[PDB]
Each structure stands twice: as structure tokens, then as C-alpha cells.
């Protein structure tokens, strides 16, 4: 009877919940980007633009008896106010499946939702680690002033740790001493486990050495985790929305509004 | 009725 | 209306609490130098100098049966009364952002405050572990009489334990028998974990082997944690102050007042 | 206005409590002789002499059904009654600092008191491990009947174990079955700790291995710490007293009343 | 109105 | 707790009084110009201009039993209504110094205030002796109708007396007779000081023989002290004002509003 | 609330 | 007023 009309809320609160836990757990296991960087608090659905800050140059601070140095970061001559994109994916649910779940009193099948959420999280990781290049957004691998460190021999056990060291030294001379987070391509990430080197890299980082599929070829980035160097503005988190109905089925969209803003471009170091 | 971020940051 | 009139403390309550919690979280989550130092009681920022006691070249004796023979007594070689510096960082806040937070009920952006707090704490660690040579201050790694111990063959598994034991031996010979705390550069500190030495060093120290990114490429310090060997005179803690209101913007300053006094310079040994 | 008078008690109750707890922690941390000497009960300030028992010679005892075998008597060969010296050390408190605490409210600093307590402990260890030859007292490494054993070169694996084992053989030949403790100079202690031999030495001793600053460059002892071999007499422990007020500077003195009595000199073996 | 330590005694 | 947040009036009544007395004593021992010049009574902050009068020509007056002589009416020959400038200087006071004063219950350090008072007094003397020129004010050296007199044969015996006498004669011829004051640059001041000149100048001039550094290399003036010839319109005297709080400091400024009106330009003779 | 004078003429 | 050993033996 309910499926005879274009239904407003086809699912009741039980399956809406079940969908919410499904998406939240799938994404939570899937995500590799959020772990690297702290999110900026939830602004809301209305917010679409946030102040994009740049802080080129270093003002490490002052020591004084009388506090007269007057040091203070300078705002960029023109605030750019970058806009917040939308990351989304779509999945179908069959009306016969919904009614079968309702009459059977059995859990509803949300495999399509889990797949859509995993793909949306993967696309989020792509946006974080690489710029859109059509929207004009700036990624970790496309940022100006990436502090490229050459990668010479890499398979001898000393070399892998040495390259991370040298990247740390570059960050040191550029002014960032904060905790380090290391993100590696799958190839060299798996390779690094040959000599137990991964634990040493993790200890040097002190915040986590993780692996991302999206990085292609050799790809290691060391990034000061701290706020005021990189941030993730969240307008609205992972949600599921109902895209009307067509052909009696029920399309839905896994949705999130994220923006990665690199406040200080010298806080990252690619290989 | 607040924002209530859903998937909390791992950090 | 708030744009036009003049008033104190722009940010209201919730926002003041947010700023304070953010700065104290950053400080605690970043400070390493305070981990091995016992702080002198909070002075209150009214006091600006502290007695810089230097108990060096102490005299033994006084074994008599009836109180004769006498003693040289204990006093600082020379009272100096060094002054307490100020560690501060200035950040700025737009008025439109504050009023947008006021009206739209979005969380206020505290990224600038968090970065200022982190940078101030990093400067505090710089001052603690190194002198500046411009204000006449002294750090652990540049003090006179630092009891240096050669650190050859650190990479080799035996060497790291050796060098540590030798440093302890030097401390004992000179006088100090205290439970120790070690501080290592990320290179050395990372290297010892692969060997397994870190458990040995932890057992010898009994109070902590820590990592500080402010050190050189290959360096470290072994210290006695006990009071009467090191002190951190505190006048005023990590705080946020309002630098008036210029041109309708809102400058704030994160503040610290610390001074590291090494009363007995023999309790330090460098690598 | 105590600065214009011969002040009777400059400090008040919480300052006295702080001073007492500081000296107590200094003593407990510093004493190494009291780790291996069982202490004869606190006699008080009144007692100034104790019986010095000499137990040269071994009386095996008797076994019989009737209990009438007339076994050799065990008693002091000749009562001596040497007196108990006083180990003390004087620190100073400046009157301007007192005034500042009274009105300015800056907290009093007792680092001089802790240093004086440490030096008093140092002198106590010197007295225990070495005689002074001016008061007719005796130490561990200067006594008559020490059963000296030659020391083979260390830094060679098993040299330390061979030496302590030899010394143990000599002690057992003199009919002492007591569990032993090994006190070593820092140099050869570190030499032993180089090769990880301290595990074997510690499990053989079962009473621990301790390092003494006073011991010469190459020196060490093994002692049977059980009572009836050695005892420590204690009239009065670390206590801080007021030595009047000269100069308007307030002097204080840490006191301790100890006397080592090596009742069985065969129980100690030097290297 | 007193000293009121904020970040301290982290040991 | 008050230091963190900017306040309109950081200092209390006691510190304000200390500031006022310090600036008053500095002005009292610094203002050479005021001692000669009579001062018109203050007007207040509101008044910004005074009637600038001129009295060219002298009407002798007459004496009669009944008083029918129709003597020339004495009045301003041309009203000018000059505006009153402001002489000021900025000094800086530190918040920690104020807090230390409050805690120690000690007088506040006003060295910067004294320096600012000294510089402001110097600037006032400069304005009085030489005009600013840009605003067109007229001074002793910039007056019209100055009755310039040669100063030849300087440093020769009796030279000073001759110069002063000639100037005195010129003033008498014009019709000015009162107690003379002589103000000299330091160079010719010492050049006449060397051999008894000062006592004769002091007697004949009858009011003063002052030295001012604001004069040029070799110059001097012999003003008629009495009022009507010259005056000093005052809006507000030496005061200290608070210019807000900047960068966690307290900038203050010494303020005066003074205007020298030379009512009768014939009362002056330059050298 | 007198306008007052601070430093009187030295004269 | 008792003996009250202060620095008790480490043993």
C-alpha cells in the first residue's frame, strides 16, 4: 500500500538508523585522511565559504624581558575565502526489497549503501591528497612549496629511514618542529616492512604512519599534524539523503561537505 | 538539534 | 551595534572557555621539557627576578664528635637574581568572523590561537633546552660543566646502552646519584627502539626516556629529575590576553613567563 | 620586623614541615650504606657511647642428647665502648629572603638545605666506608682482617664474575654463610654493566649491587649484610636545627648521629 | 585571584 | 587578573600622584624659560586660542588736579587671535612594572616619565626662544623689531658689560626700563663667566643671567622681565595622559598647551 | 572640580 | 617525644 504512491519517507526510523550505523562504520574503517589531520568543527549545512589562510614566512616567536619584539603573523594582502565543495555518491534501493524486509521482519540489505559510502570516502581521500584541478582546489601533492626531498637509493634498510630523516631536517630548517604524520604509497609502505623499519618510522613520526591506495608510484608525505598548518572544514558530515523516486525504486545519496585548507604550505614535505 | 558531527575524527 | 560601540572582552563566555581549553590542551599535548622538570611555585607575574643559586664547588667535612672543626656552610657562590623572560605570540581575529559566529551559531575558528599556543610552547622548549645568548640565559645543552660523554657507535646495539651507562657513571662520580630522565633527538630515540635497547634505558632511568625535536642531529641529555638540581620558575602560565581593539580587528596574545635555573650544574650530562 | 632582632624562630610550622620532608627525601634517596647495614634501634640524643663487640673466632656449637657438652662461649673478647660522632652540615637563609616571604609572599627556597643534607649524607657514607684516623674510627676498606683478594683486569668478560666468586670462596672459608651484597666503585661497576654480567652477579648476591662515589678508581667490597656481622647505631637521624642568628643571616644545621660497628670483621672482603 | 596554575605539574 | 584585559585607567590614585609630582619636579628644575617669562593664568582644555595683542608706540600719560588732558587711548593696534599649540612627549610604562609595584607596595618607577618631562621642557624652551616657523608663531629670535646690536670684541675684558650696556641703552631709548633679564648660549656664557663678568651682568640686569642650550652657537637676549612686554598664555600645564594600551604596555604622554605672546616687540634686544 | 594649576611660574 | 626514627632504613 505504501509503495503505491511517491513516498516521502519510505524507510521508518529503524532502517534509517541501521543505514546510519552502516555508513558510519564503513566510512570509519575506510577513511585514511581524517586520521592524518584534525577536522574543523561542524559549521552547518548553510555555510559554503570559509577563509582560506596563507602564512608564508616564519615568525618563530620572541624572548624578551619587556615583550617589545611585537612579532605577529601577517594576514595575506587579500583573503581568498575558498568555497566548500561537496563529496557524494549514489545508490539504489529496490522497493520490493524494502517491502520484503518490512514483511519478513528481517534486517534490510544495505550492501549498495556500504559500497557507495566506501567509494565516497575514497573520493574524499583523493580530494585531500590531490587537487580537483577543475575546481581550483590545492592538494597535498599540488601545493606550492612542497619541500621536495630527492629519493635516491631506497631499498637498503638505512635509506628508507634516512629519507624520512632528511625530510624532517627540511621541516626543521623551514621552521616546523611539531609532531610528524607520514603517509605512504601502498608499494613502498608494504616494502618498508622488510627490516622492521616501519616501527622506527612510526616512532619518529609520533603520530602515525599510514598507507593510502590513492598515492601512485613512490609517494611519501610528512606533514606537521598541528592546527594552523592544515585543517579540514566540515560543513556537514557523512549522511544519507533521499533523492526522490524514479521507476518505483528509491535512489539515495551518501553525502558530505568537506574542504581541506592548507594554511601553511611549508608544513608538508613530499618525496 | 545541534550540529552533532557524525563520524568523529580519529585523532 | 557591537561594531560601533567600544567594549571589553569581545568574546563572550562559551568562547572564552573554548579558547582556554584549546590553549591548555595544546600546551599539555605539546610540552616535553616540563616532563623532566619540577616547576617552582607560581610567582604570579608580579615577581620578575629569582635567585639564581649556583651550588658549585661544595665542601665536605664536619665529622667531629662535639661540634668543633666548623664548616664552610652552603650558599650560592654569588647572588645574581636573573630576570624572568616573557614568551608570547600575537594572533589576530576579524570582527566579521566573530559576529558570524555570534549570529549563525557556528563554532568560532580557534586555529590561530591553537597555532600560537603550539609555537609559544615550542619556544618554551627552545629556551629550556638551549640558551639564547642574547638575554644572558642558559639552557641544559649549553651550560658550563655539562659532563660530556662521548657517544661513539650509537648505531650499534651495544653502544646505546654503553653510552647511557657511562653517562650515569659520570653523574655518580661527580656526585648525583638520582633517578634519571633521558631526552633524545628523534634520530637516536628512533634508532634505539629497533635494537630493543629502549627497555634497558627505561629500566636504568626509572623516570622516563623522552623525545624532543629541538635537539641537534645526534645529541641527547641525561639528567637527574630531583628538585635542588633543576627548577622551572613560573610567573604566569599559558594565557590569552586582549591587546585592546585596533581598527575594529581583535588582536590577542598567548603568554608564558618561565625561567629554567640549573642550581647544580653537575646534574646534567650531554651526549 | 625580625630583621632588627635576634630572631628566635624565623620560620613557621609549614616551613618547618617542608624543610623536614625535603631533608628526609634527600636522605632516603642518598643513603647507600643504610641499604646494606641493619640499624640498631634509635637510642636518642642522650646516648653517646655504644658497646663495640669483637667476635673474632668461631664457636661451632654443640649437639647432644643431655645438652651438656660445654661448648665454647660466645661473647665480646674485650668491651671497648667507643663513642658516637656527629655528622652535620650548615646551610644558610638570607634575612632579606625571609622578609620577602613575610610580606612580598614569594615562596621560600630550601635548595641550600637539600644540598647541605646531601653533603651530610655524603660524609656519612665516607665515614661508613672509610675511617677518619682522627677519632680512632674504622671503615669497611681500612679494617684489620679484611681478607684482601686480588682483582683481575675487568673489561674482559667473566673477570668480574671470577673476582666476586673468589671473594665469596674466601668468605665461605672463614665460615660465613650469610647472603652477600657487592658495593663497587662507579668505574668498574660500569665496566661490569657493559657486558650484562650484573644479572649473574645480582642473582648470586641476592642482596643487590650498589655503587658508591667514595670508593677509589678501582675498588670494591663484598659483605655479608646479615646481623651479627655488622651493625649501624643510630642515636639521631637527619634533623634540622637553628644555630642562633649571627650576621642577621639565619644559619641552620642538619644533624645525624651514627656509628658503624663491624662486629665480625671477617664478613667483609675488599678487592 | 590567586596564582591559579593552568598548565603545570604535568609530571 | 587585571593585566590580561585592557582598561581605561590602569594606574590608581597613588601612581597618578607619583607621576604628577615627578613631572612637576622635572619641569621645575628644567624650565629656564618660565623663570623669566611671566605666565598668563591657565584657561582650560576647551580654549584653543587667545587674543594676540600689539602695543606699538607709547603714550606718556599726564597728571592734573582734575584730569583734563585727553591722553592717547591705549589699546591693541591689531588683534590677531593666534591658536595655542601643544607640546608633548611620549613615554612607556610596562605592565609587569606596575604589578611589581602593586605587590611589593613600593613606589612606581617613573624614569621614562622623567625623561619625557625633560624632553617636553626642552621642546617648550625651543618653542619659546625660536619659533616653529611652519605654523608662523613668533619667538624671541624670530621677532620683528628686535633691535639687533653688534657683539664685537667678545672674550676681551669688559666686553660683556659693553654689549649689555649698549642693549640697555637701546631699550631705554625705545622706552623700556624695568628689571632686565639676560639669557645667553652656553658658549659665550662661559666666555664671560671666566673673568668676573657674571656678577656685573647680574647686578646691572637685576633679574637674571640664565643659560639655555636651545640658543645657537653664539647668541643672547636681554628681555624686559615685566608683564605687558611679554606673556605666556596657558591652556593646561604639565600633565600626564593615557593613550590607551598597545601591545600589553601603557603609553603615556606629557602634555602642555603654551603660547608665547610678545605683546611689545620693542622690549627685546638680540645679540 | 577646580581647573587648578600644577607647576606655578618659577619667577 | 618517642625515639621516632625519621629516615627509616631502606633495607
General description of the model:
- The structure holds 8 chains of a larger assembly.
- With 271 residues, chain A is α/β, with parallel strands linked by helices.
- Chain A folds into two domains: 2-57 and 69-140 and 230-262, Major capsid protein gp5 fold; 157-224, hypothetical protein PF0899 domain (hypothetical protein PF0899 fold, 2-Layer Sandwich).
- Helix content of chain A is 30%, strand content 20%.
- Chain A has helices spanning 13-30, 95-104, 111-129, 157-174, 186-191, 197-205, and strands at 39-40, 62-64, 87-93, 180-184, 206-211, 220-224, 231-242, 250-261, 268-270.
- In chain A, the strands form two sheets. Chain A has a four-stranded mixed sheet. Chain A has a four-stranded mixed sheet with strand order 5-4-6-9.
- Chain B has no helix or strand.
- Chain B is rod-shaped and about 25 Å long.
- Chains in contact: A-B, A-C, A-F, C-D, C-E, C-F, D-F, D-H, F-G.
- The interface between A and C is large, with 43 and 48 residues.
- Strand 2 (62-64) of chain A pairs antiparallel with strand 4 (86-91) of chain C.
Task: Write a brief structural summary.
The structure holds 8 chains of a larger assembly. Chain A folds into 2 domains: 161 residues, Major capsid protein gp5 fold (2-Layer Sandwich), CATH 3.30.2400; 68 residues, hypothetical protein PF0899 fold (2-Layer Sandwich), CATH 3.30.2320.10.
- Give the class of chain A from helix and strand content and strand pairing: alpha/beta
End-to-end CA span of chain A? 61 Å
How many β-strand runs of chain B?
A: 0
Question: Which percent bin holds the helix content of chain A?
Answer: 25-40%
> What name does the CATH topology of the largest domain in chain A carry?
Major capsid protein gp5 fold
End-to-end C-alpha gap of chain B: 25 Å
The best one-word shape of chain B is rod-shaped
Order of helices and strands of chain A: HEEEHHHEHHEEEEE
Number of strands of chain A: 9
Q: What percentage of the residues of chain A does DSSP assign to strands (E)?
A: 15-25%
Output the CATH class name of the largest domain in chain A. Alpha Beta
Per DSSP, the total helix count of chain A is 6
CATH architecture of the largest domain in chain A: 2-Layer Sandwich
Oligomeric state of this protein? 8 chains of a larger assembly
> How large is the radius of gyration of chain B?
8 Å
- Computed over alpha carbons, the radius of gyration of chain A is 23 Å
Number of spatially distinct domains of chain A: 2
Main beta sheet of chain A, described?
Answer: 4 strands, mixed
Strand order of the largest sheet of chain A: 1-7-8-3
Function (chains B, E, G, H): Cargo protein of a type 1 encapsulin nanocompartment. May help nucleate Fe atoms in the interior of the encapsulin nanocompartment. Present in about 92 copies/encapsulin nanocompartment.
Family (chains B, E, G, H): Belongs to the ferritin-like superfamily.
Region (Probable targeting peptide) (chains B, E, G, H): 5-11
Protein name (chains B, E, G, H): Encapsulin nanocompartment cargo protein EncC
Amino acid at each position: 500500500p505504501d509503495f503505491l504512491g511517491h513516498a516521502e519517507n519510505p524507510l521508518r526510523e529503524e532502517e534509517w538508523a541501521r543505514l546510519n550505523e552502516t555508513v558510519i562504520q564503513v566510512a570509519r574503517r575506510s577513511l585514511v585522511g581524517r586520521r592524518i589531520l584534525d577536522i574543523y568543527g561542524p559549521l552547518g549545512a548553510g555555510v559554503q565559504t570559509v577563509p582560506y589562510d596563507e602564512f608564508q614566512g616564519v615568525s618563530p616567536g620572541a624572548v624578551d624581558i619587556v615583550g617589545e619584539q611585537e612579532t605577529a603573523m601577517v594576514f595575506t594582502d587579500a583573503r581568498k575565502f575558498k568555497t566548500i565543495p561537496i563529496i557524494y555518491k549514489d545508490f539504489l534501493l529496490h522497493w520490493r526489497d524494502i517491502e520484503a524486509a518490512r514483511t519478513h521482519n528481517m534486517p534490510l540489505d544495505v550492501s549498495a549503501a556500504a559500497g557507495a559510502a566506501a567509494l565516497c570516502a575514497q573520493q574524499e581521500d583523493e580530494l585531500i591528497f590531490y587537487g580537483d584541478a577543475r575546481l581550483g582546489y590545492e592538494g597535498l601533492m599540488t601545493a606550492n612549496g612542497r619541500l621536495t626531498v630527492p629519493l635516491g637509493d631506497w631499498t637498503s634498510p638505512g635509506g628508507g629511514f634516512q629519507a624520512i630523516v632528511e625530510a624532517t631536517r627540511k621541516l626543521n630548517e623551514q621552521g616546523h618542529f611539531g609532531p610528524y604524520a607520514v603517509v605512504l604509497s601502498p608499494r613502498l609502505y608494504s616494502q618498508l616492512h622488510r627490516g622492521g623499519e616501519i616501527e622506527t618510522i612510526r616512532q619518529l613520526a609520533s603520530d602515525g604512519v599510514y598507507q593510502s591506495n590513492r598515492l601512485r608510484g613512490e609517494s611519501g608525505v610528512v606533514v606537521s599534524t598541528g592546527r594552523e598548518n592544515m585543517d579540514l572544514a566540515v560543513s556537514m558530515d557523512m549522511v544519507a539523503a533521499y533523492l526522490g523516486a524514479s521507476r518505483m525504486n528509491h535512489p539515495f545519496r551518501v553525502l558530505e561537505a568537506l574542504l581541506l585548507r592548507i594554511k601553511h604550505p611549508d608544513a608538508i614535505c613530499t618525496l | 538539534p545541534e550540529k552533532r558531527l557524525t563520524v568523529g575524527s580519529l585523532r
